[model samples]
Target: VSVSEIRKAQRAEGPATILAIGTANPANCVEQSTYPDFYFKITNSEHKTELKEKFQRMCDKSMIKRRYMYLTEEILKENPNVCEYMAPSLDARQDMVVVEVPRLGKEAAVKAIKEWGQPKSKITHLIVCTTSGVDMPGADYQLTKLLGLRPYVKRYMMYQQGCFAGGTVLRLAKDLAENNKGARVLVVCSEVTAVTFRGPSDTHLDSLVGQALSGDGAAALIVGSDPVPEIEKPIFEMVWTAQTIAPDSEGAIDGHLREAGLTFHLLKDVPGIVSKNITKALVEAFEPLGISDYNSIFWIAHPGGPAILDQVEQKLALKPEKMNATREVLSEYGNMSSACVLFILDEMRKKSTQNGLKTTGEGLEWGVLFGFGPGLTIETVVLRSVAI
Candidate 1:
């Protein structure tokens, strides 16, 4: 039993559009060799040569080998995955992921707000979201500096919230726009997952896993009270948001500091937990919208991983190929942390534009967006397409 739409509005003439989304990550920060060598040096055994051979094999099939710049021979030689086992090529990109959030935090916000074509004086609030990296005063401070935003502009930073931060930030922006009637809110989410793999080799499989898959990237979106004159509004309006937290499951997926770098331990049982609870969360998210008919609706789930997505798709009874965008992004960019969904959205946007289906008016276009992180939590939004 899903929910129905309660606050549907006809946006023939309205406000609040997604002006722009910008994403970036670090450059040649680390590579497959980086980990294999680290592992061989620490393990210090005759298997070092054998392990190096294995690492090369792994790189051949790694998801990031060709994608990231850091997968240079130096980084790959030290990588644990390469040293200890036959690792495969990864989807690593050349961009530095750790620096991605801060850089993107500033750039995306500036671009999105600038697209409004309004002077800096008109902006009201800035929301920065991230799950990777820790810094004081927050990324918003840098945003204020680089973007020349008004000093008085209100700012909020959400950190360590994991992938769910994106959905959470957007929810807050939606609430502000609905309540204030004329507020402008900027939302930024970025991750430099590669940074967590910096420093000497730890040789742990978990460390190897982190280095192999994580990537850097960022995105920005602007939500305002009303549309600017002549500019089209957001293709999707936030109808409702639903949140779910699994208390016992928090330990299953913990990310924190380790000697080698920041580390993430996703419980092997994550798929089970997601399968058990996602149906209920989905029901609650769509409850307000009275949307019992979801057969035709599109799904834009954050591709946490192949297994996690498989679980969600199975529970939702979605068609096997409906989530090709998610898979494609994962294959191309690795798991970009908070920025993964934005990449997925960008892919969808490009396709929609190319197909000449860019309009979100008249016809009902409903969908669900979700993200997951440390709390074993889920942040979900029910949205209807707008004109973009």
Candidate 2:
């Protein structure tokens, strides 16, 4: 079908809209200054000078000042020997996830539901995404019990999809909401990256990068077919979601299972790979919607790291201020994995509301959401804010 024809069809079939979003972080906050010292204390390495110097350099350039985690400095101090010499076992890390995920996830879910101003029982579908840990009857089942959701509520989990899983879950939720009349889908993404931490022997550049930049966070959003009430906030409609995988770039980024815990591999070429593939993926995502001018659209991009953001800005020719929200989030919380984009969205929403600005009601509105992950994957969601 022609691009205009496709756009016409989309307009005829109303899209699912994001009603509200809420995000949560663990109580434990760690400053970047303390990180080098923490690592030095934990590592009994003979090459102390080399390791310390490299770690400090990475921390200095991380663009992150603080991050929240389930594993706090207090816990490290309490169990000095256990945490100092060796990384947590796979089983132990998973156990930590089982305890921490639900607590943070529940907080985020409850906040979203409350902001939505709907009864918890009204939710018809629950969609969850996580990559840091796994279990039988995982977050979905545990959340159902914790939130007292109805037994018949349908549940879907997107596991091990990496950072882009947030966009993946939202796409699934959009389909469910659009197909089922009066459906309300609750989407939650939570991660506890501290559980994936490595010890001295594993302290390479990739491991150090992950250690310095990763964080823990959870975010929940309510999506549905029904229009948002006028007294409430404006809703961001899901216009289009597109994903692409770069060829021969499988090794650029990966998460592997090992005896110690889940380990992350990030090649130096990741930023360049992402930069090359993103423009094509974004064009594919927007063309079908009859959108060609990229500059007019507001951007909600995942802050993978400083280098990733810099590459995106240069390749897309975006103004420096366009990425301010992303940069702010990275500096405050580092990368929260799948939950990162939602935090950016929340910031945008808050900014708009604070300024008392509403989107154009004539349907020329536009925004773009982008995320990257393993498979050298690029996912883009084109959005439009509509009046009820």
Candidate 3:
């Protein structure tokens, strides 16, 4: 059944409006040009010549200029031995996550709330999403304390959902805000991919690709039923969200616990798998909104890689300019896991604001958000630029 039919069966609710968004990156920034040499030096491998050539080739083709991380290049200088590449134990990685995730998450949330002109205490619900790290008290708890949120505020922690988790959190926030009057939901997504570093023993192309592509970042959003005044800022109305899993492609991406840390298994055919399933998933997701023309909507894709974005553009028959934000984010930050899409949205928001673009009759200025992750899943959300 179509999403429209499903919505018809259920009573319609108030629309959830995205009032503001904020993003934060770690203090340490590493240029892609210097990454290969740094990686080779730290990993000290027996196949130095071959590995150096392979890494240099990948770096040159990655289309990325720089990425931020909690683990700085200074770490390599501190320990010149390649043997310390993946030396951090599983516990050590978790410890880093417990400290860093909350710090970054709080920074983003504070900025979003401040921009929205909403007090932190007004947030009735909090949702934190992450796939890179896990802690007992979790990010949700730490954020509430640091942000001075009410003690009785509801909290949710979403984990292990991979890169699509940010879209999932948006969907959840929309439901929460729409169902309850005066409800405000704060969504925070933080990732620390540097902690998932693999050892030299795992030198598969996929592993190397993961190492080259992944980075660390965080993003936050404030969703509520009350719309921001038109004179204040442009706001996005949450239209609808849909998701589908590709058949027989479950093994394309996997992350499992090992003695060292969370080890990822990224298959070489991931780009192909995504290209095959994305168009169908997107059509089904947006068809219910009476949106079938690709040119009518702005595309904010996950930017998993340059290849993924290229395939999406060709398969969807979208204009070259439609994915400008996606490509720009990939070039600047690499792939920041689930936080990637939020960064793209931030970029689009900035551009739209600068151009004074506003939604017209019936809120026709539509934006489609797409993200792919483990389970070979495709998650999409339709956003309408609306004014109150």
Candidate 4:
């Protein structure tokens, strides 16, 4: 009887819920129209007169409106080390991400904290993920000081976690929030491309895709189970989270990483077809819930690239609005790796609420927040919007 009572008390009454979300991007905004020209100019790659329009057409199809980045042409030109084939991309960007990550992350986290109507002291745990600074006292550690989280607050840091960091952090927080009574877990994903910005190569054209798309941004979310009366309200309910990691091959992201974090993002047009794989994964993700009919659920896919959204949309037979939130973030900010998906989540929830919709996911009762890559993996999170 005692064991039963303890076990029951260990879990929250309701599912894990997202209480607040915040997002931030660096101030340096690069227009898509001029990005290619700017890229060639900064790298002194304008010598390749032939490839100028070729690359222009390439980015045009990418459908990016503008992107925010920390490093600019002037900055790179002034400090030629980051542009050169110097081997310090890892360490240099490591420090860059460390400082900028927390600073940008703090901005978003504060916005979330203020929006949550909770003092910073109320946060009981933190989860910070990034693809930089592979050393002790990681960005997650630094974030603690910036956020002023307590010594007793539990912390989890993910380094080299890549684009899927968003899904992974939320999945972990769902478990943490439910198990720890009254716990509020702060989730952060801050991705910067100080290391990614570099000169273009004649032979390596695939790098252009990553260079053109991946940008810099940070996102913060407050997750907890069992909201207090009027004190806390939720945007989305954490329903189910499942991960599917399949076998080998090419990847997405990284103009800078020596093939640092790549995975099959554009399976259909890029040679291999992963629709079978993704479909199988989602099929399993929904099996327990007895869910089917793709038309019924909204999709918040990580806009790794325009091709990615097209790929999923083609496979699922989903309507255009299904991925509007996903497309909007990608268009505005480019791909901020792990932080991109959270931006979509925050935007979707906020827009739906402001629109007088019935639920967070554009009024859809069920939705899936998808993240992939940095490794050959897919993080599929089943979400149920908090109906108004």
TM-score of each: 0.77, 0.90, 0.90, 0.92
Worst 10 residues of 3 by lDDT: 76-85
Per-residue lDDT of candidate 1, residues 1-388 (tens digit): 3223222431122434455555555455444445455444544443546546555555444544323333344654556543323232122211233344566566556656565566767667888777655566667777777777789878888777776676787778776666554567777786755445532233544444554556666777767656655663454566777777865686767776533445566664776787677778877866666776555566677766566788777877877767876777777677777778876766666566666674432233777778876688888877676553
- lDDT tens per residue, model 2, 290-374: 7787666777787778888898889989878777778888988989989999888887777666666665221237888888888
TM-score of 4: 0.92
Which prediction has the highest TM-score against the true structure? 4
For residues 1-388, what per-residue lDDT tens digits would candidate 4 score against the true structure? Answer: 6998898877777799999999988899989988888888777778887666678877898888998988876667665656653334555566666688888888889888988998888889899887744557777778888878887779898877777778998899999999878899999888887756656655556655677788889999999999996899888888889876655534433223442322113322331233546788778878778888877887787776787788778887888888889988988998888889899988898788789998888887888888877445688899998886
* Candidate 2: residue 285 Cα off by (Å): 1.8
- Model 4 clash tally, residue pairs: 3
Better of 2 and 3 by lDDT: 2
Clashing pairs in 4: 251-262, 251-263, 252-263
Candidate 4 Cα errors over 4 Å, as ranges:
1-10, 85-89, 248-274
Check candidate 3 and list the clashing pairs.
none
* lDDT winner between candidates 1 and 3: 3
User: What is the C-alpha local distance difference test score of candidate 2?
Assistant: 0.79
Report RMSD for candidate 2. 4.8
lDDT per residue for candidate 3 within 195-294, as digits (tens), equals 5765444456666777788888899998888554662253677788987888869688887766567767776477788888877876787777777888
Best by lDDT: 2
